């Protein structure tokens, strides 16, 4: 029915975004834009027609089953996720996000052991912060007594800071109080474009 591509699109202000949609049927195709936490807005219909309040920058075109939506001169407001539609059917969506270009900045790395208060509840969370870095790609590597930890943690990233254009990431490794008290050396190893070599911030349990 409707195959929409690509899944994601990371672009800087000024560039042009080209989202594609493949149909197998025919009839009025439309494009919608959804900004984080808001209702979708009709952007284009009949494949080529702009809606009210939509500027020249947005344009659509067609070839057989293929439909493109083209957004020239991207700006902050334009970023979000886009959907194609044919009658009642929708595409899987394409997330278009903002990456304002800037000079490379290495992460500040901090590690936090579990608080005593948390340990008292019979659970333990080790937190690793990567502060103010660019670009957004980065890798966190948990190690417990030099043992690589695969699948015991969760990451979370802020959106690009409006003031300095950096990113921050937080990684949380969770364990049973007994497991936490089984081992000694808790290490967080960070790799990034700004680091000539991986950086390991660490600590020993109960010190």
């Amino acid at each position: 029915v409707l195959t929409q591509s690509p899944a994601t699109l990371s672009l800087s202000p000024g560039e042009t975004a080209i989202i594609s949609c493949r149909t197998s049927q025919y009839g009025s195709l439309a494009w919608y834009q959804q900004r984080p936490g808001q209702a979708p807005r009709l952007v284009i219909y009949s494949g080529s027609t702009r809606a009210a309040g939509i500027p020249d920058r947005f344009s659509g075109s067609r070839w057989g089953a293929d439909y493109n939506l083209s957004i020239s001169n991207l700006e902050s407001g334009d970023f979000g996720v886009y959907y194609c539609q044919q009658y009642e059917f929708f595409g899987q969506g394409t997330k278009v996000q903002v990456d304002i270009k800037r000079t490379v900045a290495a992460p500040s790395v901090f590690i936090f052991p579990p608080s005593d208060e948390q340990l008292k509840s019979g659970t333990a969370s080790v937190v690793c912060l990567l502060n103010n870095f660019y670009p957004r790609e980065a890798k966190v590597q948990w190690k417990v007594d030099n043992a690589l930890q695969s699948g015991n943690s969760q990451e979370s990233v802020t959106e690009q800071d409006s003031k300095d254009s950096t990113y921050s990431l937080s990684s949380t490794l969770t364990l049973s109080k007994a497991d936490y008290e089984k081992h000694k050396v808790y290490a967080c190893e960070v790799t990034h474009q700004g680091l000539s070599s991986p950086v390991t911030k660490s600590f020993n349990r109960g010190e």
């Binding site: 009025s28 439309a30 209702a39 009709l42 539609q85 948390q118 969370s125 502060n131 937080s170």
Partner: protein, 222 residues
């Protein structure tokens, strides 16, 4: 002008049912269908069905037949949706929509120009729960990072400020994450000078309105 006033979002458990209203205004309510569409984060949008307000004729998507009911009140231009036998798949933001072409002579349903604000519906077997706020104490360039770990709360959202809002510089509150337990958890960090860990006091003000719990957690070096 055309305004689709929706009823607010709600919290549901699996097996319960939900009811949503959408008030139409600014146009003749009988002229064109009213549609219901759900949007789940990271998932293909799902048209549920339309209702033609004149007789209340409906067309329900195959997926929902039996579970869904669409009615309306012509005397007050309000549309109604009920969804029964909820599971966690029914967690989405439910909208009511109306096409652009809408005249007494003709309509085109599927160019959704008008949307309601939305109604976030979450379906989980988790009950409401206040968060536990644990310190992320600093240790020893010339800056130290400290913060709050806000663990095990349901549902969203929770709000975090520092020193009653008097400290906004270098503050990063992270997007909460959903643990396999079903509860949520987020961290909020802040960078400060190293020459202040013994002078300036740092308090993390966490407020979780649903459970009505407020915590002023003081973060200090261990």
């Amino acid at each position: 002008q055309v305004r689709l006033s929706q009823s607010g979002g709600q919290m549901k458990k699996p097996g319960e049912s939900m009811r949503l209203s959408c008030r139409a205004s600014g146009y003749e309510f009988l002229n064109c269908p009213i549609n219901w569409i759900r949007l789940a984060p990271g998932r293909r949008p799902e048209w549920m069905g339309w209702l033609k307000p004149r007789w209340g004729a409906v067309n329900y998507a195959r997926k929902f037949q039996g579970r869904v009911t669409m009615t309306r009140d012509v005397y007050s231009d309000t549309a109604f949706l009920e969804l029964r036998s909820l599971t966690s798949d029914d967690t989405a933001v439910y909208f009511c929509t109306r096409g652009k072409y809408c005249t007494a002579r003709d309509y085109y349903n599927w160019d959704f120009e008008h949307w309601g604000r939305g109604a976030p519906v979450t379906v989980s077997s988790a009950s409401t729960k206040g968060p536990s706020v644990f310190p992320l104490a600093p240790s020893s360039g010339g800056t130290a990072a400290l913060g709050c770990l806000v663990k095990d709360y349901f549902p969203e959202p929770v709000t975090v400020s520092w020193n009653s809002g008097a400290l906004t510089s270098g503050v990063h509150t992270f997007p909460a994450v959903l643990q396999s337990s079903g509860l949520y958890s987020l961290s909020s960090v802040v960078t400060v000078p190293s020459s202040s860990l013994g002078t300036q006091t740092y308090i993390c003000n966490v407020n979780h309105k649903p459970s009505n719990t407020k915590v002023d957690k003081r973060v200090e070096p261990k």
